[PDB]
Amino acid sequence: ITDPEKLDQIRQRESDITKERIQKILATGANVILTTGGIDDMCLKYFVEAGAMAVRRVLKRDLKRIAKASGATILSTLANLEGEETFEAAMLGQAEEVVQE
Amino acid sequence: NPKIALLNVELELKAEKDNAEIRVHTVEDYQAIVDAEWNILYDKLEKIHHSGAKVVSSKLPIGDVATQYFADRDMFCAGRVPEEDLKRTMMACGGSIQTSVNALSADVLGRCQVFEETQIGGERYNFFTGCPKAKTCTFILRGGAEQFMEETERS
Amino acid sequence: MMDVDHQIAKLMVELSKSQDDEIGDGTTGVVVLAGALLEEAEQLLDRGIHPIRIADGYEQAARVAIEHLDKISDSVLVDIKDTEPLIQTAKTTLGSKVVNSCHRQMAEIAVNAVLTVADMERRDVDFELIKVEGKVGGRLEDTKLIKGVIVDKDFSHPQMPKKVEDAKIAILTCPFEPPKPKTKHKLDVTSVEDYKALQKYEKEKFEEMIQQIKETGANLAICQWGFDDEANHLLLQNNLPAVRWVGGPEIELIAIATGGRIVPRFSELTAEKLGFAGLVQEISFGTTKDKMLVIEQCKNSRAVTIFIRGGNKMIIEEAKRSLHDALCVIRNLIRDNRVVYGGGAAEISCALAVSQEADKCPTLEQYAMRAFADALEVIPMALSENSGMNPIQTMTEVRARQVKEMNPALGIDCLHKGTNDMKQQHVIETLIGKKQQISLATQMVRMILKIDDIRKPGESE
Amino acid sequence: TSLGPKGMDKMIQDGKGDVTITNDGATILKQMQVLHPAARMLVELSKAQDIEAGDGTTSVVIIAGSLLDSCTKLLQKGIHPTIISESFQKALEKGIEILTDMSRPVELSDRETLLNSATTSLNSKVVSQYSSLLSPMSVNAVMKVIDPATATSVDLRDIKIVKKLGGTIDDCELVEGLVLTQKVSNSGITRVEKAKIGLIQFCLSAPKTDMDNQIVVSDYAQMDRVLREERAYILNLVKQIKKTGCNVLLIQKSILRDALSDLALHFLNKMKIMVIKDIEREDIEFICKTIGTKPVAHIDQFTADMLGSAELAEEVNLNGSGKLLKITGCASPGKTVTIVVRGSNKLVIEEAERSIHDALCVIRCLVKKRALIAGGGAPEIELALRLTEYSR
Amino acid sequence: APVNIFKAGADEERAETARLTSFIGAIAIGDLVKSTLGPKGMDKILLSSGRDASLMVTNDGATILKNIGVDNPAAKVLVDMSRVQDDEVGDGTTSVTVLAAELLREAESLIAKKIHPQTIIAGWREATKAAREALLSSAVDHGSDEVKFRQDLMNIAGTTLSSKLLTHHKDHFTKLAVEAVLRLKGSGNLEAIHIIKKLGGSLADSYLDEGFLLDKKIGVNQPKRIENAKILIANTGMDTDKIKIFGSRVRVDSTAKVAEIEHAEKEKMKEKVERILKHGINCFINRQLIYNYPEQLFGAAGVMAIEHADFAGVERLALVTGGEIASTFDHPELVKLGSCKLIEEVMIGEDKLIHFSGVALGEACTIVLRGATQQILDEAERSLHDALCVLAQTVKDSRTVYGGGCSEMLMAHAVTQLANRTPGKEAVAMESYAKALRMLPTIIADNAGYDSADLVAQLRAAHSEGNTTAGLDMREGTIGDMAILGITESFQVKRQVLLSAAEAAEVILRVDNIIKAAPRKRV
Amino acid sequence: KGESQTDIEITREEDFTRILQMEEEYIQQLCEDIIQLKPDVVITEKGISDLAQHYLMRANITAIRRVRKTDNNRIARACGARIVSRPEELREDDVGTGA
Ligand SMILES: Nc1ncnc2c1ncn2[C@@H]1O[C@H](COP(=O)(O)OP(=O)(O)O)[C@@H](O)[C@H]1O
Ligand SMILES: Nc1ncnc2c1ncn2[C@@H]1O[C@H](COP(=O)(O)OP(=O)(O)O)[C@@H](O)[C@H]1O
Ligand SMILES: Nc1ncnc2c1ncn2[C@@H]1O[C@H](COP(=O)(O)OP(=O)(O)O)[C@@H](O)[C@H]1O
Ligand SMILES: [Mg+2]
Ligand SMILES: [Mg+2]
Ligand SMILES: [Mg+2]
């Protein structure tokens, strides 16, 4: 950066791009989110506020058995012919009850 | 009848301040930086020149560029001189050691009569002689052993 | 090259090193003379004489040997045509080494190698201008005096011409590359027009560094640093042979032998800074891949190169040490043009001078001066022992003939050459060579006689 | 005891701990590591028999071990060794003339003559009970890649051998296509019919150059122009691949940068394209000769002419040690073939690999010299009787 | 110096064990390689204690002495003497080792005779001067009448290969050695004859290739054979250039400009290959490595690409095709291309090699050595190297002398004729010089098993009255004429055997004190 | 420090003093977002700088510094609060009234 006035706009952009994906995969009706990567403490706020279950650091072999049995699509990134954030919301999985016993 | 230029500057092409980052944008200005680095060193050699200073003495090393420049202009130089020898050289010729080459004049250069490089004991020695206003001297010892000359120095 | 851990014998190592650094001819004789003064002082020590009184008696006895050595001394060297006293002086130094097969050939090499590089106005000889190189192969008779320089030729192109008839040598110190600065740059490229400007910058730089040599009329280039692959083919298209990766002081010898100037950059090249040379070629030696440079023709060069060949590395490294002693005795003749006659002739004549002044007066130091004269006779009697003769039989005959008449140059030899006259056998040594043999051996004896305690430790750890 | 059909194998356990069972004489002497200087020359003798003939390599030690054993009485009878070397050359030059008269000129068009030659070399190995399958597969793996009646040379480097643990030796296959041991990412399809295979040496990832490249971000909206332009870059690479008409991609294994990123993997899965990574740089010669593809380096030259063809390119999900690829059928097949070797243990496959190479080298000798003799100690008796009459 | 020793761990000896250890250590070197001299001498097998011992059988005396590692100080002079003999003439390294050891063995006989060692040096300098005139006056020159010079070259290669492993292959390996140097037609660079060793086959299956062989086969999707092609080689970088500007980065503001730079990088790499195919070529040889982006460009244009042959591989291709290196492609009218007929690939020992069949101006050869073991191929390579180096100097110095013991008896006769015109002090040392020259036909005669006491006596009686060409016949075991049998050696080879052994024996005989220092890490 | 490779090139004199003022204004931005709901006790799991203590001092706010993660989930059930990780995304339902 060559100007100190453009400092805080870059620092807030590291979380605004992060919260942009978390709002378009959650407003389509998704309640259970499984992730093989990592969900940090800032992203856990958007599921408690919306009332959604977020599971992190699951196995790659366990995600394929859930997505094949529930009709979900194993998505890695954004896609579908130069779209900003589409997520293909018709390809969500289904479940009768997701209960932690 | 030479004149001695006692210096404390580097006569090398690689004289860098160790914090300079020359960011260039085009190839027309890239060649201008490399031509400027030779023009910085050659401007220092023109300050030693045109003043009568045929003998150059500096405690800092001199590269291959300034060595060949003085050989073409029929000038002698001597780099990496110890600081104990330049302090004795300053009181012998009656000059002054100039770190910056921009303030060179007739009042800061030395003056002697006989300046030769002999072959005493196999090794070469650049000796100065003939200056009447000599506030110092040098006693060269010659012996047959290293412990013989150390006792002669102690005596 | 010994591993002697003895502090008395370590001073004999520095005594032979001090003779090599100053004169360089009597490094063997200065150790036998110092051991002879201490052997004669052993019997003087048992008689009750103080060791400093023997040391003070040797200074009054060595002073007579210096003044008597300056009696007969003359040379007619003019470095034009009277090289006959210069060849016979170098034959005395080379006669004791293993170069006696080339006793006439290699003696004339060391005479002409000094006179072409010496400054006769200052009487100063610089040994940095005399390059002594060696390569195995051939024989000892193939040692030639190459007027010029001999370097390892490193033509980057294998199709380069290996023979230049008339070389306009362009000596430069800049590598054949785009100019890289000495500081950190990190040049920024933004658009594709700047990257296409990078290609045209280097393409015109290799055409500029090649054209600036051809505009000066040069047909040979010397470079200290490496070459680029793009610059190698541009040498063959323009018919410009060039060598690569020459050493530091090697190109310093090219600019003196060819009369050229070492140019830092390519822009400062001109026709006045070019060197002149004749037959520039590389010579392959047998099955090896060295291809050293041979410079046949020159124009008033002040730098020569001796190429020593032999049958093995034992005969070459000794010939580098043997001929260096021959290059030093010609240097001592320019420093002082006075000579003496060796073969033990000067030691017997100096032993008679101390014995004549031992009676004028025999007050206190009579026994100390006679021990000096008996120790000066050890060097000629060692020549009689190595030649298969008898020491006390041959020395009594030569010493008696110098008293019955006026003392001539009377010594000994191995095959004896008929008569024992050193003036007829042409055994000529320098005055300052034997002047420093008596002076350094006396002062080293004084530092090993004036010591009465040893404080050496015990074991190493 | 390791010569002939009634010979037994040897097992050499090295200092590392990799014990292998071997019956071929070249593989035994290379693992024994004999310290005697005269016995190491017999190791290199069996090594050059494996290079020149391939099927002479226990027998060259029995001959050279007996020719020196016959020199024990010769050196104790005042015969100089130069006289023995002169007479052994005269027995050698007369020995080839005896074997040439026993030879029968054959032709490579007769499959029954080549079948009995390959079955003879398998009788001494562990696959002598599998000579009804391996010996027909050894002839068909040679006579389809030599292009006979036109050349007297055959390279065995065009016949790849894949070693997989599982099953028995009867489960071996002679698939003429390409067999790869790499996995399929992503493995959601693993089968495509009428496939067009393309070899890509370009790295489908973020743009980077050989020179040092950096991105300057000094604006709020400049971070949006970094991620969204990188997605539009690889989308132009996938759509250039998809509009060509290919369904199977073979990406060469890159070391400097990443060959296939996670962003590039998601676009190739939505285009229904099977992607295979980690193709070695030394294996691209065998791929382009088998399928018929061309190595595509830049994406601007990726056209339909540089693609291949395959009737079936599927990943055969095996029950044993994982799975492999198997391309079945291709237009204009080259002079290459692949042999899949099975086995119950890891030691039987290493012996079955050396026994197949001893079987392919027998048919290799028939291409260079179209002549054969009787076996089973037959020419050694005729060399013993004719040279005895020659010595008289 | 032994009495009151002032050394730490170093020892020395003066005139008692100095010449004793010098004569023991030098004779044992000469008696080691004594059994390898002559056309009927055996060979040695050299082995180490372990840790990749790498056994290497050699009959040449230089390769034996350079690997044994003698601990004797005076024996290293004879080891270094045979190293120079291999580097200068390439032959006579065994003959110079036995001759230098027989001089010191005769000098050990002068120990009990109380002869001064400087008298033996002065006696051998006059003996060596008389021996130089015997070889110089008996040298046979060859100028014109080239059908006798090519027959003379086969006698040189037939004499050198007779003392090696190639005993019963003189009908083939003589033609492989004469025609290899005859195809050079110039200087003896001794690197255009690239020797390729391949296992499998006998030594009679070896041959001299009419063209040139190479490795690093032609690309992936490139043609394997092109008839009547124009060969252009190169020594330039193809891909990942990083062209000569250290400290230059690509500093952009967006990732779309990085895609424009890397497309501009591949366009300049494409434009470089487009400058190569403007010459109208069909084959390309690069000394550096060729990556995948220029390899597709040569394959689309039907041009071969041989990547990373060798550093000296482009030098042999420049001498066998008649082109130039041509590392810069900007002037097609100043670049000379090569010429060939077939660039087909041949298979030698289950390895595909690129055969450059039918080349023009072929001043380079390729010897395809095939042997039973690797030990035979390592011996036949050094045996051919000892034969090609003499023929590369026989074309430079056409003077030849009659070998097989005939040259040694001519040298021993000139010393004995001048030993009778000398006083008795130096005449005894000259007779010991002539006896050591007669030992060299005695070692050759006794290695075959002949009566060496009578054959050298018949050679001395023959050379005493005429018979300047009489020598030792090792075929039948008698005395025959060397001009009829055709056993000749080069003059410069036989001179370096005489001269280097006389200089090396001069050094060891002049040693009266061996002062060895304390070694490091030896306890 | 952010999770990036942020590096500032300071050429003018006013640029270095502006960065040290933007670090103070960033703390005042998040401290103004948490006082719009008028709290009394602010409890976090990470550090609180002295500039953040200055705005909470004049607003009469008691701040606890380094409460554990397991203790924050326990006080969220006792007081009825919601653990937020963003000061500018605070709502009225995230305030633990009834304590
Ligand atoms: N032809 C000769 N006749 C008599 N004596 C000679 C002859 N040549 C050399 N010498 C003697 O041999 C000695 C060799 O001394 P040297 O070992 O060379 O001294 P340094 O070790 O100082 O070089 C000389 O002192 C000289 O007197
Ligand atoms: N069916 C058979 N009947 C008799 N002998 C056989 C039969 N099959 C193979 N042999 C013999 O077994 C031997 C196997 O030799 P082998 O070890 O393969 O030689 P190499 O090690 O050179 O390949 C052959 O010499 C052959 O005579
Ligand atoms: N056909 C022959 N007849 C007689 N003597 C021969 C014949 N061939 C070789 N020789 C002798 O064998 C010797 C072999 O010497 P060699 O070991 O090759 O010396 P170097 O090791 O120096 O090359 C030669 O000196 C030569 O005289
Ligand atoms: Mg001397
Ligand atoms: Mg078999
Ligand atoms: Mg020979």
Examine the residue annotation and report whether D57 is marked as an active-site residue of this protein.
yes
Q: Are A10 and D223 in contact (CB under 8 A)?
A: yes
CB E418 within 8 A of CB E134: no
φ and ψ of D184, to 5 deg: -105, 120
What is the position in ligand 2's atom list of the atom closest to the CA of D23? 17
Asked if C327 and C116 touch (Cβ cutoff 8 Å), the reply is no
CA–CA dist C19, C31 (Å, integer)? 10
Rounded to 5°, the CA angle C62-C68-C69 comes to: 90
Which tokens belong to C110? 């060391």
Three-class secondary structure assignment of chain F: CCCCCCCCCCCCCHHHHHHHHHHHHHHHHHHHHHCCCCCCEEECCCCCCHHHHHHHHHCCCEEECCCCHHHHHHHHHHCCCCCCCCHHHCCHHHCCCCC
> Helix H segments across E74-145?
75-88, 95-109, 117-137
How many A from CA of C93 to the centre of ligand 1?
7
Tokens, residue B146: 């290293």
Structure tokens at E88: 């200068």
| CA distances in angstroms from C50 to C57, C451, E349, listed in the order given | 10, 12, 90
For chain C, how many residues are written? Answer: 461
Q: Is D9 a catalytic residue?
A: no
Cα E246 to Cα E244: distance, rounded to the nearest angstrom? 6
- The SS3 of residue E326 is coil
Q: How far apart are the first and last CA of chain E?
A: 23
Chain F: touching chains (3 or more CB pairs < 8 Å) = A
Q: What whole-number distance in Å separates Cα of residue E395 and Cα of residue E188?
A: 9
DSSP state of E517: P
How crowded is residue E344: how many other Cβ atoms within 10 Å of its Cβ?
Answer: 14
Mutate-to-test residue for ligand 1 from C19, C412, C424, C427, highest number of ligand atoms within 8 A of CB: C427
DSSP annotation of C136: E
In the reported structure, the alpha carbon of residue C343 is separated from the centroid of ligand 1 by a whole-number distance in angstroms of 6
Separation between Cα atoms, residue E439 and residue F91, nearest integer Å:
114
> Which protein residues are within 6 Å of ligand 3, measured from CB?
E 37-39, 60-61, 85, 91-96, 159, 162-163, 386, 403-404, 444, 472, 474, 487
Q: How far apart are the CA of C62 and the centre of ligand 2, in A?
A: 98
What residues pair up with D57 in beta bridges, in sequence order?
Answer: none
Closest CA to C29 of C437, C329, C440: C437
Contact, E355 vs E342, CB < 8 A?
A: yes
Could you tell me which chain F residue has the CA closest to the CA of A13? F2
Of D35, D80, D297, the CB nearest to E293: D297
Which residue bears the tokens 């015997």? E134
Which among D58, D119, D290, D293 is annotated as catalytic? D58
Is C30 in contact with C437 (CB distance < 8 Å)? yes
Give the nearest partner residue to A76 out of D219, D223, D266, using CB atoms. Answer: D266
Question: For chain B, percent helix, then strand, then coil, each to nearest 5?
Answer: 35, 15, 50
Q: Is the peptide bond before D345 cis (omega within 30 degrees of 0)?
A: no
* CATH 3.30.56.10 matches B1-155: no
Q: How far is CA D143 from CA D52, D139, E171, in A?
A: 19, 6, 39
Angle (nearest 5°) at CA D307 between D301 and D311 = 165
d(CA D115, CA E208): 38
C132 close to C322: Cβ distance less than 8 angstroms? no
Distance between CA atoms of residues C211 and C213, nearest Å: 5
Q: Give how far the C-alpha of residue E36 lies from the chain's centroid of Cα atoms, to the nearest Å.
A: 17
Q: Are strands D191-195 and D310-316 parallel, antiparallel or unpaired?
A: antiparallel
Method: cryo-EM
* Alpha carbon of C312: minimum distance to chain E alpha carbons (Å): 5
Both structure tokens of D255: 């070391």
DSSP state of C267: T
Q: In angstroms, how far apart are the furthest CA atoms of chain A?
A: 55
For residue F55, count other CB atoms closer than 10 A to its CB: 16
**CB distance C116 to C108 below 8 Å:** no
Q: Which two tokens stand for residue A37?
A: 């990567």
Characterize the bridge pairing of strands C242-243 and C187-188.
unpaired
Instruction: Return the structure tokens found at B70.
Output: 């003085």
Name the nearest CA neighbour of A21 among A54, A43, A52: A43
Whether residue B64 lies within 8 A of chain C, CB to CB, comes out as: yes
Judge whether E27 and E105 are in contact, CB under 8 Å: yes
Range of the domain at C220: 149-335
**Residue in this structure with the two tokens 């973020």, named with its chain if needed:** D206
Nearest-CB residue to C181 (from B33, B65, B119): B33
**Residues A9, D220: C-beta atoms closer than 8 Å:** yes
C364: tokens are 């206190």
Query: Cβ of A38 under 8 Å from any chain F Cβ?
Result: no
Non-local CB neighbours of C141 within 8 Å, separated by 6+ positions = C101, C102, C105
E357-369 core/surface letters (b: 16 or more CB in 10 A; e: else): bebeebbbbbbbb
Place of tokens 């003070």: C56
- Put simply, whether A91 touches D (Cβ < 8 Å) is no
Of C11, C6, C37, nearest to B147 by C-alpha is: C11
Residue extents of the structural domains in chain B: 1-155
- Provide the chain E residues 5-24 that lie in CB contact (below 8 A) with chain C: 6-10
Question: Whose CA is closest to D58, among D22, D23, D25?
Answer: D25
Torsion sign, CA atoms A42, A43, A46, A47: negative
CA quadruple E332, E336, E340, E346: dihedral sign: negative
Counting ligands in written order, the one closest to the CA of E159 is: 3
| B141, two tokens | 């010892």
Residues 6+ apart with CB under 8 A from D176: D144, D333, D337, D338
What are the backbone dihedrals phi and psi of residue C106, each rounded to the nearest 5 degrees, phi first? -75, -20
Tokens of F40: 């009394």
SS3 readout for chain D: CCCCCCCCCEEECCCCCCCEEECCHHHHHHHHCCCCCCCHHHHHHHHHHHHHCCCCCCHHHHHHHHHHHHHHHHHCCCCCHHHHHHHHHHHHHHHHHHHHHHCEECCCCCHHHHHHHHHHHHCCCHHHHHCCCHHHHHHHHHHCCCCCCCCCCCCHHHEEEEECCECCHHHCECCCCCCCCCCECCCCCCEEEEECEEEECCCECCCCCCCEEEECCCCCCCCHHHHHHHHHHHHHHHHHHHCCCCCEEEEECCCCCCCECHHHHHHHHHCCCEEEEEECCCCHHHHHHHCCCCCECCHHHCCHHHCCCEEEEEEECCCCCCCEEEEECCCCCCCCEEEEECECCHHHHHHHHHHHHHHHHHHHHHHHCCEECCCCCHHHHHHHHHHHHHHC
The minimal CB distance from C157 to the residues E125, E268, E325 is found for E325
In 3-state terms chain E splits into helix, strand, coil percentages (rounded to 5) of 45, 15, 40
* d(CA E38, ligand 3 centre) in Å: 5
Instruction: Tell me how far apart the alpha carbons of residues E487 and E494 are, in angstroms, rounded to a whole number.
Output: 13
Q: Is E310 helix (H, G, I), strand (E, B) or coil?
A: coil
CB contact under 8 A, A10 and D220: yes
Residues of F in contact with A41 (CB under 8 A): 85
* CATH of range E212-365; options 2.60.40.3120, 3.50.7.10, 3.10.180.10, 3.40.640.10: 3.50.7.10
Inform me whether the C-beta atom of residue B13 falls under 8 Å from chain C C-beta atoms: yes
**DSSP calls for B74-94:** T-EEE-S--HHHHHHHHHHHT
- E147 Cβ partners below 8 Å, 6+ apart? none
Sheet with D274-279, side-by-side order of all strands: D197-200, D248-252, D274-279
Written as one letter, the residue type at B50 is H
Question: Three-class SS of residue E400?
Answer: strand
Separation CA C222–CA C241 (nearest Å): 9
Q: Do chains A and D touch (3 or more CB pairs under 8 A)?
A: yes
CB pair distance less than 8 Å for C18 and B145:
yes
Secondary structure element (H or E) that encloses residue E19, with its range: helix E18-32
Nearest atom in ligand 3 to the alpha carbon of residue E159 is 8
List the Cα angle F1/F4/F9 in 5-degree steps: 80
Q: What is each CA distance from F16 to D217, E370, F21, F26, in whole angstroms?
A: 19, 78, 9, 16
Subunits with at least 3 CB pairs below 8 A relative to chain E? C, D
CA atoms within 13 A on the CB side of D74: 15
Question: Which residues, at least 6 apart from D307, have a Cβ–Cβ distance to it below 8 Å?
Answer: D196, D197, D198, D244, D245, D246, D293
The answer to whether D220 contacts A6, with C-beta atoms less than 8 Å apart, is: yes
Cα–chain center distance at E46: 19
Strand pairing class (B114-118; B125-129):
antiparallel
Sequence-ordered alpha helix ranges (H) in E198-332: 256-276, 292-300, 313-321
Q: Which helix (H) or strand (E) holds C375?
A: helix C366-376
Chains that touch A (3 or more CB pairs under 8 A): D, F
Rounded CA gap, E198 and D7, in Å? Answer: 31
Question: Which atom of ligand 1 is nearest to C425's Cα?
Answer: 1
Q: Supply angle C-alpha E42, E48, E52, rounded to 5.
A: 120
Name the amino acid, one letter, at D359: A
> What is the Cβ-side half-sphere exposure of residue E336, based on CA atoms within 13 angstroms?
12
Instruction: Give the contacts of B68 (CB within 8 A, at least 6 positions apart).
Output: C173, C261, C262, C263, C264
Residue E136 neighbours by CB under 8 Å, 6+ apart = E491
Q: What is the DSSP string of A3-71?
A: -GGGHHHHHHHHHHHHHHHHHHTTTTS--EEEESS---TTTTHHHHHHT-EEEES--HHHHHHHHHHTT
Tokens of D341: 């070797």
Structure tokens at A83: 């779209």
**CA E489 to centroid of chain Cα atoms:** 16
Q: In angstroms, rounded to a whole number, what is the distance separating the alpha carbons of residues B109 and B90?
A: 9
Spatial CB neighbours of E6, under 8 Å, sequence gap ≥ 6 = C4, C5, C6, C9
Cβ contact, residue pair A42, F86, below 8 Å: yes
- Per the structure block, which two tokens stand in for F21? 């003022």
Please give the distance, rounded to the nearest whole angstrom, from the Cα atom of residue C429 to the centre of ligand 1. Answer: 9
